Amino acid sequence: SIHYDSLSKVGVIKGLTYNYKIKGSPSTKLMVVKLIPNIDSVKNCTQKQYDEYKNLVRKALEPVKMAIDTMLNNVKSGNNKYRFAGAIMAGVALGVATAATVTAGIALHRSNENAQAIANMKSAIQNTNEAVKQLQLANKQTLAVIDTIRGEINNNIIPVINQLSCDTIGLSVGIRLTQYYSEIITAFGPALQNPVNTRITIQAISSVFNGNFDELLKIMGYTSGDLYEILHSELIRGNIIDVDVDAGYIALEIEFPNLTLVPNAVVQELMPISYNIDGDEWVTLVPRFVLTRTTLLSNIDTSRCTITDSSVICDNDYALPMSHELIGCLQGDTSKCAREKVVSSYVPKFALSDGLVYANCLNTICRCMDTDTPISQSLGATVSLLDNKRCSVYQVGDVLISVGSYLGDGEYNADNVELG
Amino acid sequence: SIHYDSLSKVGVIKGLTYNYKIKGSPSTKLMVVKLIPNIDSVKNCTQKQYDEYKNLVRKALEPVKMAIDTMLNNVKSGNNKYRFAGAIMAGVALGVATAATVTAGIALHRSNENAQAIANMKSAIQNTNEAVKQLQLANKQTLAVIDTIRGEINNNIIPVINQLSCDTIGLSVGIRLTQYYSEIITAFGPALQNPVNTRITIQAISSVFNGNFDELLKIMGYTSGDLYEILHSELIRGNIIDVDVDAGYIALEIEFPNLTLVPNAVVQELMPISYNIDGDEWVTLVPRFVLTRTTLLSNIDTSRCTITDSSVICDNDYALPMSHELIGCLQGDTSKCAREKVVSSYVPKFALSDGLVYANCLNTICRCMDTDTPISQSLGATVSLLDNKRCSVYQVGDVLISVGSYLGDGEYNADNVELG
Amino acid sequence: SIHYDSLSKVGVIKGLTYNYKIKGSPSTKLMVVKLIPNIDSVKNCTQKQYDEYKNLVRKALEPVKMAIDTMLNNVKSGNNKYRFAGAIMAGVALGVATAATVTAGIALHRSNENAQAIANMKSAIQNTNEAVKQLQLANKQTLAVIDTIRGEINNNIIPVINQLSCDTIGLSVGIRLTQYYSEIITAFGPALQNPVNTRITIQAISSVFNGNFDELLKIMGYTSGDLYEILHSELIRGNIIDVDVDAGYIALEIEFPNLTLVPNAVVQELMPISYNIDGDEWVTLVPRFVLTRTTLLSNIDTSRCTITDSSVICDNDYALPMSHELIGCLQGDTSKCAREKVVSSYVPKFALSDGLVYANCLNTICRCMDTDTPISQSLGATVSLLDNKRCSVYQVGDVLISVGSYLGDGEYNADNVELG
């Protein structure tokens, strides 16, 4: 319970209401990002710059493969000793880890049969001559292959190649290769250092492809308009499963999760306004959002979640405990609520809820428009309630509002309430 | 009062001084952003990809117009019942809202006559064939029309169109349309969801126009060098007033505010240094900036404001209350000031103010350069003052400084001050 | 000491270990950024737009040179009066400053002989016709000169110049100049306002050169693969030393620092898990990282540092003091540790350290796989220890793990420990 009838007399008013959703089971797709382009159409003019680029790429990829091969051996070393049907992590060889790292280490082994199927297509992956392409694995699964720089050459150099000289072509292509290297290090740098525990969103991945994430979703067989709820929440993420150093490519597995609606769970918003005490202006201190689950009250940090037109969407169940004074305050003992003095006009003075208006008519102008007379609260009353029994249209500050009727047994009274 | 003479003996020294400015009355201009380009120069080669693009745009715009039409009906439903000269909000139909939402809902109705004037120019808006254009409304007001992709076709495809094949042109244009769609969703996505309460800065708006905000200000009749104080503060912002689904465009109103100088208001900076107590090194805890208005002291969170060479500029009056211990400390009762022990050399040891130097000569080397002898403070004194009565140039740490004269009645004394 | 044997019984477990590194002595290089391009190849077609651009650039540069000339006079006014071999700051003319500002003001004078050598090359700097170039000063030092827009004209306009008309060329170049002006104001705007105290990273500087920082490091004679540890930490930074208003260029000095390994300093990570008290689930509150230097314990805010595979790298020594209750807790008086109640399943239940597993087997399923039987802790015990004396493979939650042997004198006991 939140006992709104006692909260209103201390400036706390009932806002909007939402349901709670959290991430469900996954679905996955395969993508290959090529770092060495198929320059074969202009090959004779640019050989010197190309040979220099390949060595730098290979030096950059060599450390990553040893991190992957190391983690694969800790699981294989277990599976070969014991009869059990599941994968077994060798704890003595690993030595120190959180439960999350052990879980991601077993998932890396579980993904290895796709990586082996990709490795059988190496010569077909090398020979692509388009900016994006689709191929079929022996698993019957499809693979998407991305090749940005061959797109740049097809657009910018080939239509004018009769005007340019051989030295101009070589010098022109050389600067484009170093720009692409700078983009790769900016997008993938953190994942190349810690490949087992790091995930990247599809929006960030697309920065290597001019930011065109709409083409990426399209070639995987989706539509960006249908995926809106998980795309806008940034829940579509990928991770590295394998690296090929001699060919120069990265293989990624990309995940499209379901959403689960939590039963008996509600999120409630609270609106604060100022109020009058014996001639001074004060404000109450409370969190903006509160979570209720099967009568239990709790805090929730919505900065780690996305708010939509009707739902709050989180990656995990971010509920947090609540202190005894705040629980006492929200359950109707207003003497336990904390308060602060007002020194700026930026704090609001009125609000609308269920068609009724609550206002602090000692610090803002309130007038009745039908009879054209001012409205005054006593120096004993903290807040004033505006409904259609007195008159049908009110001026509040510099706005005109029409109001509904009060669902109660008599006149609203706010004289001399308990507070602390 | 801040009683700097007592604060100096506890390491708190007087810094720079600024005046306070807050946002004033507005001025506005009109802009139209087109989502469906005028492809008419290459039309025969790209019809298949164009027809697919238009349906996706229309599906994306259909939800936004219903949010706008819904809010317009809540005001019209009031205006038709009553004689009053101002606009009236229907509170029963709206049900729940903050004062800010009611205010933005009335402003949306007030802007509707410009939207109707724009809607009379629809055929002239469709026929533009340039990246940016100016038109005249029947209000005598001007309108700026933006068309990015027709600029791309004029630059990249038309000069080489004799070299490319029909299939190459179609495939080439198709990827540019999906890239533009990805850019729109990234820039406008939050505003398309909540069009009544959301505002966008001109810098962010320009990301749909290659980031060239200088052209946008130029066609509206301004110069980016004159607008520096409001542009650098990020106070130039726009909001959506209407949407046309069949033609595929968004109409925006853009605001250029005035700045108001608050009378009798001053912002004062404070500089902390370490100090000596009985052989140990300590530091005092105080906020960096303090606000004084007509003798009243208050806190101010300058992270929400911009600091210039002479003024602090804020969007609203962000003043906040101050606790009784901090007020006691700043008004000269140093026994109420809070302190901390020092465990790193990154904390500073000296500072310059009004041509005089204050230093902790037990934790840094202080020497007189004229006589070439060291300077020592007793174990009873917290801080030392360096002025030109003793000698004219000092070495402090690894820097040489020349100093002024002390405006006082005698020798400065820092023995055994009151502290807690 | 951290007395891990008492901490384990309250859910705090030993994580990874790192060494501490801080920034050392500098090394520097010279760079010139040109704001007025060498349009001389298309000059006849674009004169009107070019003359308009130059006046706006000069108006933008005029305020910056007076800030530089003002600070240079405060040092020169000292050096001319006194015999001392070092530079002398005039404190009366400066009036108010922090020790950091005095230090940067003397450094600006120390850099002035390079600025004079650059100023002798003005006609050679103006005549460059390439996107990037190298020149030699009379100091025998090299200078790197950047010219982005001449690169754009060499790539985009000259190969098609027989197809375009004179008016098309002029209009086309004019929009590229205003886009470049918008990019300059976005990258350098804060430094142009406060040129003495502001530094910019090489990644941010490169945004004026299509983001290609790899070319910048290459022409300065480095390789981005060797500089990884300081580049990834973002310690490579530059600052403005001079401005030329009539020619329209900015001169920068760029710094490549060394790293110093602090002796006898270690950073230790801590892993928290939940635990059982009399039937309820609880958690302990402690910082993630702790710093030890020659037996002294301290806090460290690693959000201002970079964490690698083995080292923590900071710009300055960010150590901070620690409270008496936390020191008491970590030195084995667990009655002083603070705790919280658990209301979400997102909190972890087990962890691996030194080949042994610690788990809360009342809130997760624990079973022995060799004998296929469940494991249970009493209602008196907070935590359970899993080692190879009982059986060699365990199921914990939904994962299978193989474990090592306990280095102790007998059975581990967690009954009825002291807590508060």
Author numbering:
A (entry chain B), B (entry chain C), C (entry chain A): 26 to 445
Manuscript text:
The HNV F protein is a trimeric type I fusion protein that is initially expressed as an F precursor (F0), consisting of three domains (DI, DII and DIII), a C-terminal stem, a transmembrane domain and a cytoplasmic tail.
Indeed, 2D class averages generated from initial cryo-EM images revealed particles resembling the canonical three-fold symmetry HNV F protein structure. Next, we determined the structure of MojV F to 2.66 Å. These were further classified using ab initio and heterogenous refinements within cryoSPARC to yield ~214,000 particles that were subsequently used in a homogenous refinement. Interestingly, while the stem domain for MojV was observed in 2D classes, this region was not observed in any 3D classification or homogenous refinements and therefore was not resolved to a high resolution. Despite an overall high structural resemblance between NiV prefusion F and the divergent LayV (RMSD = 1.8 Å) and MojV F (RMSD = 2.6 Å) structures, there are some notable differences. Conversely, the F1/F2 cleavage site of LayV more closely resembles the NiV and HeV site, despite high sequence homology between LayV and MojV in this region.
